[PDB]
């Protein structure tokens, strides 16, 4: 047990991720943010000073359960009011279990502006990891556009919508290249980068010694891109996923969607006289972004010594069978917690893309989420019944819905009610994907649950029917916090409503979140303790806690 | 027979083909240029005045045979010295046969700048076409870049080479739209163009009346793209290819490579209350350019009445079996001239991408063409034996060459010798494609012969061998002036060397010709008559012919 204290300021600054200058949101003058590293069971105290000028900020600690501390989850209008310019707020929370986690902006579209970094929790003090490696490498993946976040925000709030488009650069630990390639050698149509190694966009090189084994920790905070990770001539052994251990298996490359984290081990077996390419390319959408590239540099080979091969070609973006083939393998490591065999609640959530009042919105069982100005945790503790809609949101959709047709948008509305759970319910969620407004298009959506991990019971094609029950894996299902629904399919997850608080469950692609694609879960709120005053200080909660009468 | 006289001035001007201003090369203030139309048997006289400030100009008339007028072909350094600023040149030639032709700049990269237009030839007066139609719709296809042609020229001549990239826009009759789509209603990701229809980039709408039949004449002067043409809900019957009638067949779309012209017939037999999409999309290279679109407007429907369907989705760019399936189906119309059955000369031309002295160049049996300052025709007529290389260029490549693997570049040279034929020779040219510099890459190349039409005897995969001799079509082969080689395959054509003059045979993709991909054929020059002085007044021809002694 130890307290790790971080003194942090967030400020916009000029920076050039791909050697083209723009503004980035840096923490203590650096981009990406600093790494937090602690051992399981420690308490992390972060005092954040907001040094932005007109904007409020919040930081969300992705994958941390916020057990006892629902108020530090870092979701504006759900766990807290956002931190005002010039104010300091303390995020104090216990890191319970080891893993590869990260943190990112959770207000507006501030994470796409660069607010994110690594949070790595080692085993309890004195304990060892269940596997052996001699070194580790940390990789955080993100994506980068050249337009302003605030021009992109106004574009997605406009009628007609101005879609943000495919990213200009895929960043690997904050660096990437635009309009040139470090692997130009293999193709005369590519431009060589004129980089010395010193630049803001020069690639983070992976230095390794031959005949050793390493843990490569990989996390994604992309706003949109689903990426594919591969190392030339090196097979990967998947050992951890979303802070939990999986039954190990070998693969030549992994798919990683936004909100996921993996640990993969590699052994430097291959010929020690050469360097090998690390390639991270786009999958799941039709690519119009070059691959993020770097070198697995076998010491003492010169880093200017190119590999003999081109980078590994990324698998075809639309080979979803290949995607499923990897996704469906992941199973819990033996010794993990097995699900409750019987559920107490099952909810069906239909994911549609709609047009509400001329605005292209995303909707879950026809409600497109719009968050209130009063934080739900505050509202529910103080029992302010006028702060949001108290009607229960829709828990099932019409079984006569044709998931292969565009929506009609007849009854689609905007709303902000909450699904409430009784503290201890075993909840089941089947996420159903469908056709979007464009004929014959259904996309992949990564869904992430705050303040909990869930067991991934299964995935299927088409519409979920009750007869699907015997395929659900109750024996070995992995424990995760992020999961994908594939085109035209469903996914079924199970968790226990055991953590007092108001938690978000939303699609982790930042534009879809900005357009309403998420729901809010709240359970055991009468068990929440005292919330920090700064978290209560706005909306309905400020109005009703500030004693300010009249005549007095 | 009439004499059709044109009086034209070539000059640059600001123009916005896609509503983005740039400079374009216009004729008499027009972009594209004026249509020439004549009847077979007429003489065309074009007096062209050069009003570019510093640059020479020539205009090549694609598909006209220049029988008796070889000096009028418009190929700088082959038929003539270019026309200097402020000078006027007379191109006087006959049109022998009916067909869809066009004209384009043939000095440096002037045609990519906009120097092109149509040249159509009707049947002899009194005679009629073998097929009936009520209307005619004419369409010239090109592609457009937003970068300067003089920066593209320099970039292609630099070490490292700077590839011109995929075009920004496809131009249908000089017009196209960039960064928005006139079909944006079917996909919220697309930006709607705001166009009242009066703009320079506003679509050229095809107006048709119901229950009528129309001949749609389509020609391509693209610098780089291979395009696929389709109209929503309508069948296309192919009746003419390169000024020659083909045996008719119905197809749902046609593929068209740079240098080809087709005439298709359609019938307006569909639901008369709606309009339909015309889509010209990129194939044979990974697309990065949006499709060219316009409407088949069934009168009296308002042209702003959009179609119920989206535009026909383009065939997958790399399905070369679908491409070959269209291409192989083309045969001469019943009654056409059949080939001489025995040949007198057979030449094998291997097509490779090479690196000669740091520069990426294209080579034909390892000679990358560099054209001399003396025009070959004048040079050969006056027997100027030092103006270019008198050593006969290779008519065969080595049988130990592996076309599946990159060149070694060991012997690759730049050259300018000429292949010579005796007037009356039947020549067969076997075009062999091979792997490029990148591993596992071979592209399509359209090849075009000047001053002759040829029979396309056949195509095949891999390297041509004596086993393939029996597959050559000698019954029904089509007469064309442009033919394609597919990835790693061969194409065999046969023609008779019966036209006195010096003729270019080259790939019609403008960068490839700029990089050396062409050969020069000469036949019967002893029988060429008087060459206009402007065509002789440069290089070694002006040297020998201008009598300016010294001491005399
Ligand atoms: C957070 O921890 C710091 C350091 O122990 C303490 O000063 C601060 O008051 C704590 N705030 C809350 C809300 O726990
Ligand atoms: C071309 O035609 C014009 C007009 O008839 C004539 O004056 C000129 O001399 C001709 N030149 C040649 C080379 O035929
Ligand atoms: Cu989270
Ligand atoms: Cu997250
Ligand atoms: Cu989503
Ligand atoms: Cu979230
Ligand atoms: Cu041509
Ligand atoms: Cu030509
Ligand atoms: Cu593509
Ligand atoms: Cu070519
Ligand atoms: Cu030519
Ligand atoms: O989370
Ligand atoms: O020609």
Task: Tell the burial category of A102 from Cβ atoms under 10 Å away from its Cβ (0-12, 13-18, 19+).
Answer: buried
Distance CA A33, CA B103 (A): 60
Distance CA B217, CA B220 (A): 10
CA distance A194 to chain B (A): 12
Has A445 been labeled as part of a binding site?
yes
Residues in chain A closer than 8 A to B160 (CB atoms): 184, 188, 191-192
Q: Ligand 4 mean position to B489 CA, how many Å? A: 51
- Phi and psi torsions of A57, nearest 5°: -135, 160
Residues in chain B closer than 8 A to A360 (CB atoms): 188
CA B250 remoteness from chain centre: 24
- Neighbour tally for B382: CB within 10 Å: 17
**Is A161 near chain B, with CB under 8 Å?**
yes
Measured CA distances, A6 to A33, A34, A125 (Å): 12, 10, 20
Cβ distance B310 to A439 less than 8 Å, yes or no, reads yes
**Closest ligand relative to B6 C-alpha:** 2
Distance CA B377, CA B362 (A): 24
DSSP A425-485: -EEEEEEE----SSTT----EEEEETT--EEEEEEEESS--GGGGGGS-SSSPPEESEEEE
- Neighbour tally for B398: CB within 10 Å: 10
Interface test with B, best of A162, A188, A409, A438 (most B CBs within 10 A): A188
* Ligand 2, pocket-test mutation among B5, B43, B45, B534, most atoms within 8 A of CB: B45
Ligand 1, atom 11: closest residue by C-alpha: A90
Instruction: List, edge to edge, every strand of the sheet that includes A226-231.
Output: A206-208, A292-298, A276-283, A226-231, A253-256
Phi-psi region of A99 (alpha: psi -120 to 50; beta: other; left: phi over 0): left
Whether residue B247 contacts residue B332, with contact meaning beta carbons closer than 8 Å, is answered with yes
Identify residues whose C-beta is under 5 A from ligand 11, the ion: B 504
3 state SS of A377? helix
**Is B438 near chain A, with CB under 8 Å?**
yes
3 state SS of B475? coil
Whether residue B499 contacts residue B64, with contact meaning beta carbons closer than 8 Å, is answered with no
* Chain B CA closest to residue A184: B160
CA distance A316 to chain B (A): 13
Which residues on neighbouring strands pair with residue A207, listed in sequence order? A297
Which residues on neighbouring strands pair with residue A484, listed in sequence order? A446
Has A146 been labeled as part of a binding site?
no
Distance CA B519, CA B449 (A): 10
DSSP A220-261: E--SS-EEEEEETTB-EEEEEETTEEEEEEEESEEEE-TT-E
**Is B188 near chain A, with CB under 8 Å?**
yes
- Neighbour tally for A70: CB within 10 Å: 31
Whether residue B483 contacts residue B446, with contact meaning beta carbons closer than 8 Å, is answered with yes
**Is B179 near chain A, with CB under 8 Å?**
no
- Phi and psi torsions of B511, nearest 5°: -55, -40
Chains A–B, number of C-beta pairs less than 8 Å apart: 33
What residue has token string 């490569």? Answer: A216
CA distance A264 to chain B (A): 30
Pocket of ligand 1 (CB under 6 A): A 45, 90, 92, 532
Q: Residue B468 has what DSSP assignment?
A: G
Ligand 1, atom 8: closest residue by C-alpha: A90
Task: Calculate Rg over the CA atoms of chain B.
Answer: 23
Structural domains of chain A in order of their starting residue, each with its CATH number: 1-130 (2.60.40.420), 131-336 (2.60.40.420), 337-552 (2.60.40.420)
Q: Which helix (H) or strand (E) element contains residue B136?
A: strand B135-144
Residues in chain B closer than 8 A to A438 (CB atoms): 186-188
- Phi and psi torsions of B198, nearest 5°: -95, -5
Pocket of ligand 12 (CB under 6 A): A 62-63, 450, 481
DSSP B200-221: TTS--PEEE-TT-EEEEEEEE-
Whether residue B289 contacts residue B167, with contact meaning beta carbons closer than 8 Å, is answered with yes
Residues in chain A closer than 8 A to B353 (CB atoms): 188
Q: Which residues have C-beta within 8 Å of that of residue B77, sequence separation ≥ 6?
A: B371, B372, B373, B374, B375, B376
Q: Ligand 6 mean position to A514 CA, how many Å? A: 11
**Is A186 near chain B, with CB under 8 Å?**
yes
Closest to A31 measured CA to CA, from A112, A101, A92: A112
Resolution in A: 2.6
CA B425 remoteness from chain centre: 25
CA distance B188 to chain A (A): 7
Whether residue B248 contacts residue B437, with contact meaning beta carbons closer than 8 Å, is answered with no
Residues in chain A closer than 8 A to B288 (CB atoms): 288
Ligand 1, atom 5: closest residue by C-alpha: A45
Distance CA B139, CA B215 (A): 11
Closest to B292 measured CA to CA, from B114, B189, B142: B142
CA distance A188 to chain B (A): 7
């Amino acid at each position: 047990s130890q307290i790790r204290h971080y003194k942090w300021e967030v400020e916009y600054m000029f920076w050039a991720p791909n050697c083209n200058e723009n503004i980035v949101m840096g923490i203590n003058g650096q981009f990406p943010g600093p790494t937090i590293r602690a051992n399981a069971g420690d308490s992390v105290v972060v005092e954040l000073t907001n040094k932005l000028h007109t904007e409020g900020v919040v930081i969300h600690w992705h994958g941390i359960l916020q057990r006892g501390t629902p108020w530090a989850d870092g979701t504006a209008s759900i766990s807290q009011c956002a931190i005002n310019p010039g104010e300091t707020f303390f995020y104090n929370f216990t890191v319970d279990n080891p893993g590869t986690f990260f943190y990112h902006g959770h207000l507006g579209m501030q994470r796409s502006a660069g607010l994110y970094g690594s949070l790595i929790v080692d085993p309890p003090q004195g304990k060892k990891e269940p596997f052996h490696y001699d070194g580790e490498i940390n990789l955080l993946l993100s994506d980068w556009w050249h337009q302003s976040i605030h021009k992109q925000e106004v574009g997605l709030s406009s009628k007609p919508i101005r879609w943000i488009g495919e990213p200009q650069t895929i960043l690997l630990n904050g660096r990437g290249q635009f309009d040139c390639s470090i692997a130009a050698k293999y193709d005369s149509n590519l431009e060589p980068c004129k980089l010395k190694g010193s630049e803001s966009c020069a690639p983070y090189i992976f230095h390794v010694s031959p005949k050793k084994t390493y843990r490569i920790r990989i996390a994604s905070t992309t706003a949109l891109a689903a990426l594919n990770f591969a190392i030339g001539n090196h097979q990967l052994l998947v050992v951890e996923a979303d802070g939990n251990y999986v039954q190990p298996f070998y693969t030549s490359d992994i798919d990683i969607y936004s909100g996921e984290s993996y640990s993969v081990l590699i052994t430097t077996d291959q010929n020690p006289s050469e360097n090998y390419w690390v390639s991270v390319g786009t999958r799941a959408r039709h690519p119009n972004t070059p691959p993020g590239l770097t070198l697995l540099n076998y010491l003492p080979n010169s880093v200017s010594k190119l590999p003999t091969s081109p980078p590994p070609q990324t698998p075809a973006w639309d080979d979803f069978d290949r995607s499923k083939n990897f996704t469906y393998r992941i199973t819990a490591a033996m010794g993990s917690p097995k699900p409750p065999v019987k559920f107490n609640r099952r909810i069906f959530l239909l994911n549609t893309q709609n047009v509400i009042n001329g605005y292209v919105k995303w909707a879950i069982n026809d409600v497109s989420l719009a968050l209130p100005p009063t934080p739900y945790l505050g509202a529910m503790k103080y029992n302010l019944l006028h702060a949001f809609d108290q009607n229960p949101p829709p828990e099932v959709f019409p079984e006569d819905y044709d998931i292969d047709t565009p929506p009609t948008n007849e009854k689609t509305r905007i709303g902000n009610g909450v699904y409430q759970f009784k503290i201890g319910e075993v909840v089941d969620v089947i996420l159903q994907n469908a056709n979007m407004m464009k004929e014959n298009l259904s996309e992949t959506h990564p869904w992430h649950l705050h303040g909990h991990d869930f067991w991934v019971l299964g995935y299927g094609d088409g519409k979920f029917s009750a007869e699907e029950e015997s395929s659900l894996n109750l024996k070995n299902p992995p424990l995760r916090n992020t999961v994908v629904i594939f085109p035209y399919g469903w996914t079924a997850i199970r968790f226990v409503a055991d953590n007092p608080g108001v938690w978000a469950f939303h699609c982790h692609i930042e534009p879809h979140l900005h357009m309403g694609m998420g729901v809010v879960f709240a359970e055991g709120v009468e068990k929440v303790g005292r919330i920090p005053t700064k978290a209560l200080a706005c909306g309905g909660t400020a109005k009703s806690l500030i004693n300010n009468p009249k005549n007095p």
